[PDB]
Amino acid sequence: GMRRTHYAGSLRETHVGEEVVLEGWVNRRRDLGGLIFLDLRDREGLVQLVAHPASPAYATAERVRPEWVVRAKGLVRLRPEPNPRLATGRVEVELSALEVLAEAKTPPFPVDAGWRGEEEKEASEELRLKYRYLDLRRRRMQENLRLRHRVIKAIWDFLDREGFVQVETPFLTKSPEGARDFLVPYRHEPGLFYALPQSPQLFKQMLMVAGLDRYFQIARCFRDEDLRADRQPDFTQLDLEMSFVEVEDVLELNERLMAHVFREALGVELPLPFPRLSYEEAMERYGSDKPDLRFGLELKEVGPLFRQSGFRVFQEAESVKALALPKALSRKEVAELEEVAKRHKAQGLAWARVEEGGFSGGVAKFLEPVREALLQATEARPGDTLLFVAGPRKVAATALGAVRLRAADLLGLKREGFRFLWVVDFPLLEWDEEEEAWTYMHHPFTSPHPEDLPLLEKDPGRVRALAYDLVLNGVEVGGGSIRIHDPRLQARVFRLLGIGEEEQREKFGFFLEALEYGAPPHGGIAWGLDRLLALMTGSPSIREVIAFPKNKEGKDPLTGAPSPVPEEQLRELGLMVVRP
Amino acid sequence: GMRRTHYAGSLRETHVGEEVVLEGWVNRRRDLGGLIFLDLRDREGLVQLVAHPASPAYATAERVRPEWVVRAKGLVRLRPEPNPRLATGRVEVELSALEVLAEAKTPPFPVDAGWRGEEEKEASEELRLKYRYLDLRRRRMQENLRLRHRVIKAIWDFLDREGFVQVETPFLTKSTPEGARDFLVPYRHEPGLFYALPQSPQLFKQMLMVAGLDRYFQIARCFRDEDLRADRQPDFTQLDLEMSFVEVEDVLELNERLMAHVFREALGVELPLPFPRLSYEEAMERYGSDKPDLRFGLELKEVGPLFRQSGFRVFQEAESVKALALPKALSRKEVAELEEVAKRHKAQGLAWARVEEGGFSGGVAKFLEPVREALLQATEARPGDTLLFVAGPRKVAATALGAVRLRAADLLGLKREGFRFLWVVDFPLLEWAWTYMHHPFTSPHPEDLPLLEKDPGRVRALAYDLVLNGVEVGGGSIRIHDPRLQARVFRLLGIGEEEQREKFGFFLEALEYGAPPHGGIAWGLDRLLALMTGSPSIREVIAFPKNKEGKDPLTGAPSPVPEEQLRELGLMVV
């Protein structure tokens, strides 16, 4: 068997007196009165080795430097004084033998602090990526990757128990989730390409046409986007699909799955069921379709209070939303929130102060005439600051919701734990304020609400979709919908989305043909697994939970990708780079 | 909750008297005696629905057609006589309600017969792939896909219990001009730059050992743009794993126990442990192949040193004479077929003779009588057998008679059953300049290190192949962890410093920061599943594979893109 008798970090006082064989890295060396103390490290943590001048191990111990790899043999003994910061801190290994398995030069940044329970100083992330195989030696990074393992295994255990079949779907496939495709040139016929899948969407629906009833996959997705907002060129989804389901069936299975994952991998109990908010409810109350429920400060509609007001900017607005903050803001901070508001298309931010009887600052003058109704509507107390955005309903909600989020940081609100929620009853179409156009919030295979089918031709903007988003702590961690299984309806919805019969055949003809062979009712969802793991670990970026990620420009400092290829190779593909 | 109360195929006599709600596809319809029989299908199998004339569902049941999707409601009853070919065969459902959820076109081929336990006529595979979502309705295809699920879950269970960490590695990585051709991905923001899809996770998994994770695995997709002949797909799946502080023995032992766990859990088959082991040299000598089929015997025997004084010059002067004893007197037709198999494998010919009770007859029988007692003790041949001989260079004679041995198995109608695994070990590190076999990180055998510069062709590697029924299903090695030894192997290969950096620079630098001893392996998961299912191609164990030519008839890929999509990438077709 193995030479190793134990993981180094697993030794305890119950092993005192045993002879052990250990293998690991030298976390740190210190010399004292002729003794050589080596902190030996493996994935279970540190244990102290002691090399005595009279031991045969001593000559070898004198050569050793940090990050060298050694095999050590000796007797577990109690330390005269224990180190309470270490799990092995009561014991040490009295070395009888020591062998160097590998030498090492000094690393470009330290990896030893976290194994001692000490705080790690911030290193340059471009350097950590360039030497990612050293960065991954740190305890925090190994914890992240081992949590990732435990989450996926929990997912397999639960979905296997629920009868889901794991199916691996293609990577070299047909050239659809609202991004650009990554292409792969076909070598034998220049001008031909594969595309990497933006998601397995069409394949998992075909697996329902095939009668497998329920599917899942830990799927890699590839999307060529502006990597703004911590995007990686490829990323991981828990993808799943079910047959003969309504929305509620998908929502309940996912809730139970999430509670299982959090229980088994984090030791956290998630109360069930998750809260549910409709799209309109979410934006009315929070000004966001990804509400952060870790704090209050809900938005209130006060437009109907100003229909007789001399303040034309309020009186003409479709909506005036208000938010009461429990603090008297400085003029600098107010201007900061005003800038946030203006960055979200608002015409501006109004403000005032609540005092014992009257109001002070900003627009207080125009607030005095409606004081009684306003205080009942906002629940504001003396010392608060009231903020207002006036305008069209979606802008006013969205602008003051972003002010709300920013203000939680300014006020230092303690936001704790994991607050999941479903957002449901999305409209089928979203209005692009900029491009003056209708676009789909979810992909084109999302089923409209069956009660709304006659509105597809009469009034498309009132049409509800059978779609849903899963939100965690103000972050979208999942999204899905019930699908269209009638080929007539899917073409009808394609026509509505501005897709003629020619484009339908060229992009989706194979899938529309599949719908004519008896497609069952089906629906599904996909989680953003990297996003979820980042939240579960409190990481600032999904790069902390991916073993070998790209940097922010989608480049790989570790390997040098992306890079040129030999001119010979590029000519074999029958392509050339166009001259600027 | 769900509308259905049960999977259609899960109903048994224990459900008699319950009212059920079922959803599925119409497998077939038959009218007999005024009753309408509908075989309702879902993934657990078929159940008979019966519509009686008085029933509200009677008119609906008469109009439904194959592959329509329906919801049925009724009472579970015993059949008057059971159909034992169905798991639900003791029961049927008396319909009270029947609702059509989707109509269906007549499929281009039948998918109904397997679910009744009947043989299925072979359909054009190109037609099956074009309508793959329909092909996957067949019972056979769903069993393959569900077996694949059970194998992967069993791998996760076992390796998780043994302390392995699953780690996902990059799909967009560095293109290298190293050997097999990469599939490329253009980098939009800087035309002329490309990512490559990974040929394997090799460098990432070794770096994970340098990172101290101790033991890793991944169900990994590999992409290799090479010749697709011999049932290859442009991408395929490996079970990929790596371990620290191991010797060859530690890797083989782990993989043996893992494989036995997989077969027990996913197939209900017991694999005796340990697996047999043969060195590469023993495998070549006894079977003429580095992937021996152990499902039958008929071992090759070296008889060269028997004819060093025989008059038969072609035997007497050959470097090697290999012999094989077949337990059947063959026809002159059969011998000439084996002879052509030998010549097709670079042999000069195939000598033969029959073994009689007192001596030999036919072919080269005359030159065999002087050495009869020794020839028979070496071949263990009995009267009635037929001796085949190939004389020539050692590797050629072995390889040719090994292929003769395989073709002979079919001629004799040998029963080849079950699952026969073995390890092939102690491969040579190199082969003639000099070149490595798989990748250049494989460790030399420690006791052969001084021969690296003196006698390189005799240096053994710490490399191993896993073979099942004559097929390579896995390969790996102990890796080099000493950078000075890795540079030493590169100097032996003539691979300069500028070429090392351009091809492995980031990994060779990683070795300078303390790499532990480590080693690993990868299984060909598709290949293993095809063997586990008796499928003739890995296409049968992949949900949506390419055809034999590498194209996808289902979606039409690879396909052109609009010129604007390609111009945005800064590339053009020449």
Ligand SMILES: Nc1ccn([C@@H]2O[C@H](COS(=O)(=O)NC(=O)[C@@H](N)CC(=O)O)[C@@H](O)[C@H]2O)c(=O)n1
């Ligand atoms: N660049 C990114 C993008 C996304 N994601 C995460 O993928 C989820 C689903 O993606 S999705 O595009 O919203 N819809 C789909 O892919 C559907 N096919 C799923 C279905 O309808 O069943 C999002 O909710 C994010 O959490 C992430 O992490 N990084």
Ligand SMILES: Nc1ccn([C@@H]2O[C@H](COS(=O)(=O)NC(=O)[C@@H](N)CC(=O)O)[C@@H](O)[C@H]2O)c(=O)n1
């Ligand atoms: N076109 C194919 C090719 C292969 N394979 C299967 O991958 C195994 C390993 O691949 S390998 O190429 O022999 N080496 C490696 O990839 C090393 N990184 C493994 C290691 O050293 O740990 C083969 O033994 C086949 O069973 C398959 O299925 N289809």
